[PDB]
Design a protein around this ligand. Structure first.
Ligand SMILES: [Mg+2]
Length: 381
């Protein structure tokens, strides 16, 4: 069960998903994007895999940090290995990130699952085999017929309800969109969606992540008359105090923190200070499945829900293994893209959804990602 190799394979995936200068996703021309796959192998030849961006698992990080911690170690000692990596972050000159911790932890979970022939959520201790998912809409754009106007969001929302989604979350306009951000426009989009889907579909909004306190209050107040389930990260999450203030001034539930650093430790501070009404976590945000589970348990002890940020198997398994999370986040979605088509490097979807809005966790070992190793080999960088 001893780890003998840690390898990274970079390949090209064909996609229409682009990201602007601020990191927001948008649909664009079909192009090839470099993707990396991390593989951990043991003495007996068993392997575990996980995907991430090339820079996160580049040679510098693999040689200086990851191999030194994993090679020659019992792969099942996930807590000891995660803690070893966490301990080296402070002195890593800012290069050993939570993102690197997440991919390594995920590969370790996949390795244990594949080695035992067990789905990761079943190994953790399963709670549910299927879970409701909300359609998470991409940030706004300036594409005619895409997500350029409030009406465009309303029209896309109708399409998502038809698909089966019981919940819908809007990500509104953000720079570099020429005129963004604009609280009034964001509210018009929210109103358009509510008008289009009716009062029975659950709605949420994840607007510009850096609004001032005054703008966030105006946004939240406008959401009141629309009956939205929650307002997500409307202000810079580095300001815990701003969230304590905003929560005390809004009726609508505030969910967070999504992007704030500090992993589960910082999440505890948000609970202690009453900075949110619903907690938030994510495998990529807190450094892996291991710390994500800790954040779920933390929230549960306070009788709170903890909504998991992000799609893909790693997050789906956390959701399936816990009770205090209302949804699995399926997206990001856009009218110009067909999410159900999947990825070219995966033979099947990790998160198939039925016509009733329930995603069914695949009955496959580990994270259950149906990897097309042949495609990856044929498209190596
Ligand atoms: Mg968000």
């Amino acid at each position: 069960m001893i780890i003998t190799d840690v390898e990274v394979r970079v390949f090209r995936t064909t996609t229409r998903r682009h990201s602007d200068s601020a990191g927001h996703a948008h649909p664009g021309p079909a192009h090839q994007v470099e993707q990396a796959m991390l593989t951990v192998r043991t003495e007996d030849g068993q392997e575990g895999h996980s995907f991430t961006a090339p820079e996160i698992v580049r040679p510098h990080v693999i040689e200086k940090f990851v191999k030194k911690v994993l090679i020659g170690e019992d792969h099942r000692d996930r807590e000891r290995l995660w803690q070893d990596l966490a301990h080296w972050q402070r002195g890593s000159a800012a290069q050993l990130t939570d993102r690197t911790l997440a991919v390594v932890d995920c590969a370790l979970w996949d390795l244990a699952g594949r080695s035992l022939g067990q789905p990761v959520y079943k190994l953790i201790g399963g709670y549910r085999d299927k879970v409701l998912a909300y359609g998470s809409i991409m940030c706004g754009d300036e594409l005619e017929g895409g997500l350029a106007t409030p009406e465009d969001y309303g029209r896309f929302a109708e399409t998502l309800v038809k698909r089966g989604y019981k919940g819908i979350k809007l990500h509104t306009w953000m720079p570099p969109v020429s005129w963004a951000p604009d609280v009034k426009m964001d509210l018009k989009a929210c109103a358009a969606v509510r008008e289009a889907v009716g009062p029975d579909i659950r709605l949420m909004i994840d607007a510009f992540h850096w609004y001032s306190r005054t703008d966030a209050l105006a946004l939240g107040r406008g959401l009141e008359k629309l009956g939205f389930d929650w307002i997500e990260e409307p202000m810079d999450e580095q300001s815990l105090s701003s969230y304590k203030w905003l929560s005390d001034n809004l009726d609508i539930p505030v969910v967070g923190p999504e992007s704030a650093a500090g992993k589960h430790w910082h999440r505890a501070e948000w609970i202690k200070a009453g900075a949110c009404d619903i907690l938030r976590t994510g495998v990529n945000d807190v450094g892996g499945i291991t710390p994500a589970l800790k954040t779920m348990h933390l929230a549960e002890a306070f009788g709170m829900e903890c909504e998991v940020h992000g799609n893909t198997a790693m997050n789906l398994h956390v959701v399936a293994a816990t009770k205090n999370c209302r949804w699995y986040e399926r997206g990001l979605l856009h009218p110009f893209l067909e999410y159900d088509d999947g990825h070219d490097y995966l033979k099947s979807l990790s998160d198939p959804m039925d016509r009733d809005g329930f995603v069914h966790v695949p009955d496959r070992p580990g994270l259950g990602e149906d990897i097309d190793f042949t495609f990856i080999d044929n498209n190596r960088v």
